[PDB]
Amino acid sequence: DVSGTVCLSALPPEATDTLNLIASDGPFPYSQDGVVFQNRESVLPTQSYGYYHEYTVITPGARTRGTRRIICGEATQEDYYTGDHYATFSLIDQTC
Structure with a gap:
């Protein structure tokens, strides 16, 4: 499951x-x-x-890729953010 939506300005x-x-x-x-x-x-x-x-999604100061990622889906504006190495995801709202 997806956790909810988050405004891009909040990430x-x-x-x-x-x-x-x-x-x-x-x-x-x-x-x-x-x-x-x-x-x-x-x-x-x-x-x-x-x-x-x-x-x-670069983690400042990390020597490795870290745990942040953006997963895109093929649909229009379907992009999910994970900050915990794929454990949880939120849909990104680019309008806010």
Whole structure:
């Protein structure tokens, strides 16, 4: 399940950066950005393979990719934010 919706302005600024990179099709800082997200645990709604893709949301000061990500769905404005390494997700509202 998805936890609820969160305004983009309420997430860390790096989330805004990732969405802008997604809009321009990169380039992305990490080679893992843009791979398919399999939704193996069925946390997000069931969709065909490849409907979801994952992108890094940089964690300031981290040596690794960290735990923040944006998962896009194929639908218009369907983007989910996770700050706990895919445990929970919120839908991002880019209008607020």
